[PDB]
Amino acid sequence: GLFGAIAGFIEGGWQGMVDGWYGYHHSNDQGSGYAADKESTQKAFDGITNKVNSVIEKMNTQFEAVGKEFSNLERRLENLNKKMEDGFLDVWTYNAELLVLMENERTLDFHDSNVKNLYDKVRMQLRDNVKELGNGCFEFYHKCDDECMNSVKNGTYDYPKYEEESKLNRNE
Amino acid sequence: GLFGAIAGFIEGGWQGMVDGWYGYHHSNDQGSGYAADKESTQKAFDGITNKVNSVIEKMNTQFEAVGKEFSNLERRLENLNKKMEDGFLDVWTYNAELLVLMENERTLDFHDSNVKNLYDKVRMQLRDNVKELGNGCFEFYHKCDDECMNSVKNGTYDYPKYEEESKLNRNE
Amino acid sequence: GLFGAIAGFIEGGWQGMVDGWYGYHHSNDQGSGYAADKESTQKAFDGITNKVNSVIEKMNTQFEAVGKEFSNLERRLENLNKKMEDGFLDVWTYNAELLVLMENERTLDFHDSNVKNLYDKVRMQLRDNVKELGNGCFEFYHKCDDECMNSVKNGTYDYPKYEEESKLNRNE
Amino acid sequence: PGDQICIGYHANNSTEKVDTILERNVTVTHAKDILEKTHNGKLCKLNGIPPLELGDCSIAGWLLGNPECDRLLSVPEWSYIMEKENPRDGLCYPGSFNDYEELKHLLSSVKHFEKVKILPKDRWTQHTTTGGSRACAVSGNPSFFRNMVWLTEKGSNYPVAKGSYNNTSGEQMLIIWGVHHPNDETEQRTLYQNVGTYVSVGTSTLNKRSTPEIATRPKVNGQGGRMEFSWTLLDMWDTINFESTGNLIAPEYGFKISKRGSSGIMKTEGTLENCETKCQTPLGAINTTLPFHNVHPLTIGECPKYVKSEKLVLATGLRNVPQI
Amino acid sequence: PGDQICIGYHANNSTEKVDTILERNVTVTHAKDILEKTHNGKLCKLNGIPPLELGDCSIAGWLLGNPECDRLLSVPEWSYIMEKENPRDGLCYPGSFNDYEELKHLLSSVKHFEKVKILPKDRWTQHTTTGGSRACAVSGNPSFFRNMVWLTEKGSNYPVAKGSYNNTSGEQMLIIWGVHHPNDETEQRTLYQNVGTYVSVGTSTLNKRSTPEIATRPKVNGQGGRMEFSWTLLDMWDTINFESTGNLIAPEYGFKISKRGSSGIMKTEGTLENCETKCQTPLGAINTTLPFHNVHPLTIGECPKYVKSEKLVLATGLRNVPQI
Amino acid sequence: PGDQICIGYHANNSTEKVDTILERNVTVTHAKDILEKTHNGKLCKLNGIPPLELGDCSIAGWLLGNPECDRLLSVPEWSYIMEKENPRDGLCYPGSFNDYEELKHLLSSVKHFEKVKILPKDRWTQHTTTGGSRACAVSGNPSFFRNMVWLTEKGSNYPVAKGSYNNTSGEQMLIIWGVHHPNDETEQRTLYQNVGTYVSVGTSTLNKRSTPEIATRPKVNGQGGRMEFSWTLLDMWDTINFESTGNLIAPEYGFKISKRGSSGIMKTEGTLENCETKCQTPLGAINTTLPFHNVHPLTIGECPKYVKSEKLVLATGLRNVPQI
Numbered sequence A, B, C: 001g002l003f004g005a006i007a008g009f010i011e012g013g014w015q016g017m018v019d020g021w022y023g024y025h026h027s028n029d030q031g032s033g034y035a036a037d038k039e040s041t042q043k044a045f046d047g048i049t050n051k052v053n054s055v056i057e058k059m060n061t062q063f064e065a066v067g068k069e070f071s072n073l074e075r076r077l078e079n080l081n082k083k084m085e086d087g088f089l090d091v092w093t094y095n096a097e098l099l100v101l102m103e104n105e106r107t108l109d110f111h112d113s114n115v116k117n118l119y120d121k122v123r124m125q126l127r128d129n130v131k132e133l134g135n136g137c138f139e140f141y142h143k144c145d146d147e148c149m150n151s152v153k154n155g156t157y158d159y160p161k162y163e164e165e166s167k168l169n170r171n172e
Numbered sequence D, E, F: 001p002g003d004q005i006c007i008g009y010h011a012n013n014s015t016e017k018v019d020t021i022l023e024r025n026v027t028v029t030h031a032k033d034i035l036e037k038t039h040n041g042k043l044c045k046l047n048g049i050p051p052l053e054l055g056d057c058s059i060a061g062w063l064l065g066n067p068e069c070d071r072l073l074s075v076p077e078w079s080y081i082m083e084k085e086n087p088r089d090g091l092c093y094p095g096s097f098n099d100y101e102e103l104k105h106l107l108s109s110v111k112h113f114e115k116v117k118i119l120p121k122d123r124w125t126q127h128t129t130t131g132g133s134r135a136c137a138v139s140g141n142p143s144f145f146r147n148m149v150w151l152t153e154k155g156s157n158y159p160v161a162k163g164s165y166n167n168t169s170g171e172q173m174l175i176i177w178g179v180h181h182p183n184d185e186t187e188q189r190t191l192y193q194n195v196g197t198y199v200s201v202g203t204s205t206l207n208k209r210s211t212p213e214i215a216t217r218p219k220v221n222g223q224g225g226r227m228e229f230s231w232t233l234l235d236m237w238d239t240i241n242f243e244s245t246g247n248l249i250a251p252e253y254g255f256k257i258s259k260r261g262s263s264g265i266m267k268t269e270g271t272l273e274n275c276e277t278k279c280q281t282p283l284g285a286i287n288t289t290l291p292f293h294n295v296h297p298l299t300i301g302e303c304p305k306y307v308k309s310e311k312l313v314l315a316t317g318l319r320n321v322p323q324i
């Protein structure tokens, strides 16, 4: 996809992550497990809700056919009426189908962007205190217990705190 | 946003940068200050100008209502005329409103891309002669005076020139 | 462009790469040369084919003018017919022209994304076994013969295999 | 090898598919179908108000009072009108109805009439009013449209027939009248005595007249003669004057417009069922919260918007990608 | 801690908001409103050319010459025509005007007439031409439409009335005529002497005729009679022949089309003010460089495009993000 | 300095340009023009079936049988009809054709007629049928529309003329008739003997009549008289009855609809050439696989979709960027 994360450098999705669209899998001495990122999921959920409403709302004063009848001496007028009502029908079917395609495209890319941005947020916070494995995972140069993992996941990871220990381990 | 820079890893905007959309804040021994990036700002300004003209121009042979009158024995024809003129009105109101939404979306993302691309351009030029702080800032491993800062800002930063000094300082 | 690769950090295109849209130029002891990336080119080719068909297909029940005649005492009806047929003509000309602009925009950005994603795929696989020069090129810290180059190009580069040799050379 | 953290995305068992400009048939984790494709196959009350079911009667058959349409002589407020494609019971005495489609269009904004006896038949004291035709037979004897009066000779005379009505009813009133075009001179003489007759109708705005046409025509329902009907909407406080030397088919009644609003004539061969809806189509009723439907373009009520689409599905979730 | 360089973006005090598909109410640094919502509330000259202000006259009142419309007997070129919704001064002698809306539509492409005296009244040497009605009274005496001639009996005779005009004027010419439908036989005899009359009109392409209808009708402006007017556009070098045995209301004039172009009839109760515009609506004039407006769909001049929108604002700048 | 690998993209010699929302005149490596702008400048057979070329004849000239149109007396199936803007050969005896545009519209769904001699002229045994006019002269002698019969006095008498035809032909049948409106009384007497005549036509659904109008009119093709034509589509198994005391212009033939389908009248001054097409425009034929064209909006056949665009070019390749 456009942002290269979904079905990209993160090769597959997680059946085990059931409480949101995007998030984490962590592995340490204490154990391993999945957790959704609440903030990015909520942000995407609100965007998507707004999108569906917007697409629906723009086709609310859409054309309506109105039944009329015509004599055998009013065939041109009958045809005009038919071409008009059918013409608008075709325009609005076009508006609906095109809009749904164009927006579906952008929806899938939006999720891709959201995953990429989440990855990059974590990456830009962890810096060289970790190895980038290239598959969506980071390997730590310092032990990162459950509280440490929680700080990464809520965006309050303390680089300076682990800077000393990580650089010694990276180099030894 | 889509590219993760605006209201993203660069968390806020600059009231102090008044002469363009994107640019720099530098800090050294000589002092500190803001400066717009002329090239990327101009490029965006021309794109945006073209966009507004394009949206306007595509609705130039847009439908016009034409006043007509009908007898009390021409109510079907009157209704046909009304449904037609109103039908086109609704189509063109749709075209206008949809277009403005879709393009507003893309405009905001365009600026986001432009900031991201500017950051990455600088990043890819500075390489390991700097630390990436994760907030839009780079911290230099060599002293970077006003002329040095100007070379970064006009895309003519000389990596080989500072390569030796930076690597010694990064390691000591 | 939106993704910053085409006419971006990769400053120019390759006249010498004739068998695909995106790919590689390699340089080693054995020689140098161009090669298209089959997988990313094919993926883009199929997307683009689908796009052109989709744009064409959405304007298939587009309006058709139907020749009718009117008396000198049916000027309102004549005008209604004309405004209708011209009105639909203008709507469909709009649909066609707008669609082609919006999609051309996205097509050029799609190619840009595809180049960026290819670069990043290679980058994320090579890791610190190479230097990122900032121009689309990577310089290797280990000798990379023709078979090595082929593994990079088909996505099966073995980082662990060269990890030891590269890190010694980067540091010496 | 140390502790790790990984970034990823949701997958599930979803088989829901969507299209984009760039790619067709994409499986997504979540999707929203926005197109109603179903209906109940029934004609229903619309917000509790039943349609007027004409059965085998046409609009003309109803308003003229074709004797086959007597169930319709007094009808309550309706939400829409059901008319068959080719109703059997219309002009039982054959003829034509001027501006008939304009009259049907008027009905798309009318939800009730009050039938008012504006020209009581007993007041035609100088003319015979019991005239009828085998074309309109009831129980094997000649009869006639219930709402109309066929004036003929009395005592072998037909004096100028004059009737007038001032619309004091409080609303605009639909009034229908006719002219009889006989087959032959025998008919004209035996019915009217006079020759070279006319029927004149006049309000403040309408002045329409007729000279009856005697002429041989193919028989329709047994008759070579024809009755040509016309109509007007008589404004509040306006007067209609009928004047004729022969061949006038006079109204006895007018239809006062007693309720106005969005309505319509639905073309259907079906019959009303004991069901309720907010949205009626000719194929059946729709009950949905979805914004679009593809059932039929001619709907009555509070309906979704019609599109020709076979499918309209919005992606909401992400690309559903096979686990590793 | 060393020297630093940072990448960033502009923020300001802007409170300008825009919508997108994905998000509503977004504050941006810069924006462009592309929708004109204002007008001056006045009816104005259009590019320096004033409209034809009919006042209390209808189009029919003007062209027939209703005496209440005498200010309109000669009018200069106009840019549009202002007509009230229900003008008081139309057919002062009551009646009808055939193809009236077609005539009004013709006026949307005409910017001036030259009124030409095609059938001077003094040439009707065998008929009386001073006939008038209290329905058209002026200063308490009977009068008549100024542009028309009511031919009546002279010396107790009405011979066949024949007039003809060859259009040598250099442009197509609008010509109006009428037939009088009397209330009663007294009227017919006292006015025309003859019975069973007709009015025939013939050009190279038109052959329209009438037999006058005597009939009792509600009085309108005091009169149970009616005048039924018809019209034609007489081509260059074509001839019109009038022939009648009674009941002809002849034109004295024709209206030569002397200027053509985009015009129109604006429905308004208002009056012309001393103002100038390039774009007139029924609510007032627009003066804007913006591409769209939402003022009214019926505009005349060089106007922006009308949309129903309440707002159309394009983002030009970026998301305006609170400082750190 | 070590071994290197570089990522890049294709460039070539392409000068193909495209537009986007954001940027105009962009050179791309590959592009697809989706707009056909060319045609062959010829009128052609459509899928092997030639059009009906009317030449100098109008639709009325053909169907009435104007003698200048005799090449058209029997014509095979057509794919479209070519008619000039102002055909010379129409109503040679001047007049009018009621509902003429409705008749032309009918022709857009008809691809062939079989002309059937429904009322053979020899059966008018009580009337003269050889009547003609200098307006319709052939070889310097009076003649008449080939498909019509001008009934006049015989032995100085004109009895009631009655003809009837039951449509047993197997399809709906177009039938045309006329009424002669003379210039003067001499004409009426010398042609018909009778005065105060009428023409009546009646089917199961149509009852149309006429009283001929005697009146002085400008001469057209030498004649101040007029013939007013009317038409009907006679249903299968229905009967048409003509009845007249004078002035009837009777059909001798009816046009049975023998092939139906999508057709149309193309307005053109041109002539058929020996060429084949699937898509005909008034400017010339189109032969293309492209989805759009801008040649002309009025096309007949299997055509691309018409747009007003000057260009429609889709980018398929990438931005074509100058080498380093």
Ligand SMILES: *[C@@H]1O[C@H](CO)[C@@H](O[C@@H]2O[C@H](CO)[C@@H](O)[C@H](O)[C@H]2NC(C)=O)[C@H](O)[C@H]1NC(C)=O
Pocket (backbone or CB within 6 Å): A147, A148, A150, A151, A154, A156
């Ligand atoms: C981000 O996560 C960290 C790590 O879990 C949070 O710090 C803990 O907060 C909870 C609730 O108060 C408690 O377990 C402890 O007080 C903290 N951890 C320990 C054991 O020291 C922190 O609250 C989060 N911060 C934000 C901004 O949400």
Ligand SMILES: *[C@@H]1O[C@H](CO)[C@@H](O[C@@H]2O[C@H](CO)[C@@H](O)[C@H](O)[C@H]2NC(C)=O)[C@H](O)[C@H]1NC(C)=O
Pocket (backbone or CB within 6 Å): B147, B148, B150, B151, B154, B156
């Ligand atoms: C990019 O910026 C550098 C650094 O300022 C420029 O080099 C200076 O150019 C100006 C104007 O000529 C003078 O101050 C000096 O000649 C240069 N700096 C010094 C003091 O050595 C350079 O011109 C810029 N390059 C481009 C391509 O725009």
Ligand SMILES: *[C@@H]1O[C@H](CO)[C@@H](O[C@@H]2O[C@H](CO)[C@@H](O)[C@H](O)[C@H]2NC(C)=O)[C@H](O)[C@H]1NC(C)=O
Pocket (backbone or CB within 6 Å): C147, C148, C150, C151, C154, C156
């Ligand atoms: C990716 O490329 C590598 C490197 O060329 C491929 O390995 C070679 O495969 C070819 C064909 O079988 C032969 O030259 C050798 O068997 C391999 N190289 C040598 C000399 O050892 C590999 O097949 C490719 N892998 C994939 C998944 O496509």
Ligand SMILES: *[C@@H]1O[C@H](CO)[C@@H](O[C@@H]2O[C@H](CO)[C@@H](O)[C@H](O)[C@H]2NC(C)=O)[C@H](O)[C@H]1NC(C)=O
Pocket (backbone or CB within 6 Å): D166, D167, D168, D237, D238, D239, E218, E219
């Ligand atoms: C028809 O009936 C009305 C009502 O009785 C007659 O009288 C007035 O008409 C006006 C019209 O606006 C009504 O609103 C009033 O109710 C009536 N006013 C009064 C008090 O007389 C009208 O005159 C009748 N028409 C004829 C021809 O006599």
Ligand SMILES: *[C@@H]1O[C@H](CO)[C@@H](O[C@@H]2O[C@H](CO)[C@@H](O)[C@H](O)[C@H]2NC(C)=O)[C@H](O)[C@H]1NC(C)=O
Pocket (backbone or CB within 6 Å): E166, E167, E168, E237, E238, E239, F218, F219
């Ligand atoms: C009506 O007037 C015209 C102009 O005087 C008459 O004569 C010609 O008509 C043609 C038509 O094309 C004009 O263009 C010419 O100016 C005239 N030619 C000449 C020199 O005679 C026309 O004949 C008149 N109509 C009748 C019935 O007499």
Ligand SMILES: *[C@@H]1O[C@H](CO)[C@@H](O[C@@H]2O[C@H](CO)[C@@H](O)[C@H](O)[C@H]2NC(C)=O)[C@H](O)[C@H]1NC(C)=O
Pocket (backbone or CB within 6 Å): D218, D219, F166, F167, F168, F237, F238, F239
């Ligand atoms: C007109 O001709 C038809 C056919 O000969 C007459 O007879 C029947 O008409 C029906 C109408 O549905 C046809 O389908 C049948 O072929 C005929 N049935 C039979 C066997 O008689 C019809 O009666 C004729 N009209 C008149 C007025 O006599």
Ligand SMILES: *[C@@H]1O[C@H](CO)[C@@H](O)[C@H](O)[C@H]1NC(C)=O
Pocket (backbone or CB within 6 Å): D025, D027
């Ligand atoms: C859609 O994709 C599925 C597999 O995901 C496949 O079974 C099916 O054939 C596809 N349907 C269409 C419309 O091609």
Ligand SMILES: *[C@@H]1O[C@H](CO)[C@@H](O)[C@H](O)[C@H]1NC(C)=O
Pocket (backbone or CB within 6 Å): E025, E027
């Ligand atoms: C728009 O946002 C502003 C704050 O930025 C807020 O004051 C206002 O309530 C919002 N308006 C709407 C339309 O919700």
Ligand SMILES: *[C@@H]1O[C@H](CO)[C@@H](O)[C@H](O)[C@H]1NC(C)=O
Pocket (backbone or CB within 6 Å): F025, F027
């Ligand atoms: C399009 O661009 C080319 C250069 O790439 C230039 O020669 C030409 O002037 C441009 N055409 C237009 C329409 O401006």
